[PDB]
């Protein structure tokens, strides 16, 4: 098994500005992917043990 | 970008100016995010087997 | 408390904590291992 | 003024080899146990400084600023009293003169009339100028002492985008030898083109009847460099590693 | 000019609850933290809690979790302190203090102080008595006369000399807890011009009952 | 919460195991502006 | 952009403006779509173990 790690949209990309995240809205679904296949890989590292 | 910071973009060009800025610094955090997690993806596939 | 700094025209968000290192006295303010602004130096007393 | 000293005369260059020296503070940005690469005009490592001595051969010559400036001199006496930086070294256009007279450092950019050799023991009058620059207040005997050599002042002088800085170093130790960390001291925002500098001495004595002191002094040029710097827990740098060297 | 207003005693029984009342003026109420400083005497100083009036979050003592509930109002610009179930060691006195925040915290600005007797006892108004020696063996130039106030609940007790017209030559002494009440005495030294020409009364003043008792010597 | 399960997921149920939802917002009170005290003007009337 | 419709950045904007505006959207839907061709070809590559 490997070290699970977990990375955040909202706190790695915005600086918790209000400007930042009316922007981060019109992008999308760009890091909703990203979040869900780090699930995904958390999941399969435990099958694994 | 001039600067990195996200409070610095707003505070310094013009809201027409800054929103060009602040587009091109996600764009940047989203593809510091795509090398990230395709790298995760494929070295748990190599663990995998 | 978290609140919103505005240090010398730079802005912020955290708390105010004691400091134990010892910095220059030229030092407006300086960065931890993570890039971030972690110290600061008030603009109206000599205070870290 | 227009008669030079008697032990003045021409001397080859004589050089040596500066070894960890010449590494200063980038930024006042505090950063603690991380690699740092930054891009300024720097000393580079495996380089010439020149050899130069005060004392029956002195020679005092006129080098362009535009390479940089690092300066380092083991004296005990103080007989360096200064600098002279100017362009075509008259009263059209602005020149800057570093003096101490022991207590406070004067710094003013104004119009300075030049001779030849000037001495102390400079220039006749000065004009149409509004920079005039009072440093702290400070106490040093300017009488000889006895024993080893105690003071070593290592100072970077450079313009960046018409700003002057000074950086300051002193610590105890006619070869120098290790690593040593500079730190910041004065800004000046002058912006004036300085072509050339010269040297100040001071003078002695128990035209060409006085007599200089028994000192050395270095100067080299900087250059573009992108040094890696270590960092400890207290802020300071303890290595440097140069990216083009070895 | 910032001032801390407090009342001067509160009287709660043990297991009820009492309220305290720390008033702020001259300055904006949710710029500052409020602190609370009891003083026990003889222990000295010890520390009750901090609140944010603005956020309403508190920060309590290990030992303190639960004796006291901290609340403010920032329509009135009032903080308040809330004791729950108070005990016979818990009588002392409380403090409220502004603590300005530059560098290092201090305290800048204190209150009137507020004594809390925590006790069963009920209100009773003072009995007060004259002390005159009633004669004289001429061998002072002076005139030494005194009250005698005692049967009073809580203290203090305000006592004066003619409504307070001699602020020199007067002695205040404490009171001796007996069977749930308070007696304390008071002396005053006059010259002997003056003790036939004015009359020396005893004017004890009780703020918690209301009741004003005057005697003359 | 349950409702704080179907806005993320986006679908009308919610099957059985352990879902991650958001982050912690902690707001900012007040703000700190902290500047020097100069009394002195500067004349750009002078150079206007 | 301002709007997503590609028929609707050509009857608004000017022909300057509207060049900005199409070329935002193509560099937005061609790293989707290569997120989709990196996602499938590593499961493509589970599939085959």
């Known amino acids: 098994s490997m070290t699970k790690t977990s990375v955040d949209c909202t706190m790695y990309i915005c600086g918790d500005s209000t400007e930042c995240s009316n922007l981060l809205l019109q992008y999308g679904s760009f890091c909703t992917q990203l979040k869900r296949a780090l699930t995904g890989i958390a999941v399969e590292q435990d099958k694994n043990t | 970008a001039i600067s990195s910071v996200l409070n610095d973009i707003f505070s310094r060009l013009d809201p027409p100016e800054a929103e060009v800025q602040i587009d091109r610094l996600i764009t940047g955090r989203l593809q510091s995010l795509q090398t990230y997690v395709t790298q995760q993806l494929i070295r748990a596939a190599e663990i995998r087997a | 408390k978290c609140v919103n700094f505005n240090f010398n025209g730079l802005k912020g968000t955290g708390v105010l904590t004691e400091s134990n290192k010892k910095f220059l006295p030229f030092q407006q303010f300086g960065r931890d291992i993570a890039d971030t602004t972690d110290a600061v130096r008030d603009p109206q007393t000599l205070e870290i | 003024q227009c008669v030079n000293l008697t032990t003045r005369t021409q001397l080859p260059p004589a050089y040596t080899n500066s070894f960890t020296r010449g590494v200063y503070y980038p930024d006042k940005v505090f950063r603690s146990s991380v690699l740092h690469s930054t891009q300024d005009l720097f000393l580079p490592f495996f380089s010439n400084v020149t050899w130069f001595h005060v004392i029956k051969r002195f020679d005092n010559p006129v080098l362009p600023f535009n390479d940089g400036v690092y300066f380092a001199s083991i004296e005990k006496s103080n007989i360096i009293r200064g600098w002279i930086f100017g362009t075509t070294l008259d009263s059209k256009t602005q020149s800057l003169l570093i003096v101490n007279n022991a207590t406070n450092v004067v710094i003013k950019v104004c119009e300075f009339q030049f001779c030849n050799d000037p001495f102390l023991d400079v220039y006749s009058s000065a004009n149409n100028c509004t920079f005039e620059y009072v440093s702290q207040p400070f106490l040093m005997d300017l009488e000889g002492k006895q024993g080893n050599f105690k003071n070593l002042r290592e100072f970077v002088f450079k313009n960046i985008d018409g700003y002057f800085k000074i950086y300051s170093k002193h610590t105890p130790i006619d070869l120098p030898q290790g690593f040593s960390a500079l730190e910041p001291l004065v800004d000046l925002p002058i912006g004036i083109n300085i072509t050339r500098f010269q040297t100040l001495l001071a003078l002695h004595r128990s035209s060409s009847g006085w007599t200089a002191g028994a000192a050395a002094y270095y100067v080299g040029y900087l250059q573009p460099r992108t040094f890696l710097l270590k960092y400890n827990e207290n802020g300071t740098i303890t290595d440097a590693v140069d990216c083009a060297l070895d | 000019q910032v001032q801390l207003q407090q009342p001067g005693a509160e009287l709660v029984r043990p297991g009820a609850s009492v309220k305290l009342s720390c008033k702020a003026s001259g300055y904006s109420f949710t710029r500052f933290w409020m602190n609370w400083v009891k003083q026990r005497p003889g222990q000295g100083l010890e520390w009750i809690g901090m609140?944010?009036?603005?956020?309403?979050?508190?920060r309590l003592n290990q030992k303190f979790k639960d004796k006291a509930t901290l609340t403010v109002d920032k329509s009135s610009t009032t903080a308040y302190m809330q004791l729950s179930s108070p005990t016979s060691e818990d009588s002392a006195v409380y403090y409220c203090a502004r603590k300005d925040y530059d560098y290092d915290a201090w305290f800048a600005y204190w209150g009137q102080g507020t004594l809390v007797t925590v006790s069963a006892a009920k209100t009773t108004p003072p009995s007060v008595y004259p002390l005159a020696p009633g004669s004289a063996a001429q061998t002072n130039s002076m005139v030494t006369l005194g009250c005698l106030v005692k049967g009073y609940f809580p203290e203090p007790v305000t006592v004066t000399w003619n409504s307070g017209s001699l602020s020199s030559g007067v002695h205040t002494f404490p009171a001796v807890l007996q069977s749930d009440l308070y007696t304390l005495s008071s002396s005053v030294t006059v010259p002997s011009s003056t003790w036939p020409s004015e009359t020396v009364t005893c004017n004890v003043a009780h703020p918690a009952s209301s009741t004003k008792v005057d005697k003359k010597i | 919460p349950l409702s704080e399960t179907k806005c993320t997921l986006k679908s009308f149920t919610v099957e059985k195991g352990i879902y991650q939802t958001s982050n912690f917002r902690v707001q900012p009170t007040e703000s700190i502006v902290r500047f020097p005290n100069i009394t002195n003007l500067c004349p750009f009337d002078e150079v206007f | 952009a301002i709007s997503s419709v590609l028929n609707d950045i050509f009857s608004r904007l000017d022909p300057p403006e509207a060049e900005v505006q199409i070329d935002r959207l193509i560099t937005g839907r061609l790293q989707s779509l290569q997120t989709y061709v990196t996602q499938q070809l590593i499961r493509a590559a589970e599939i085959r173990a």
């Open positions: 609140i944010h009036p603005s956020d309403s979050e508190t």
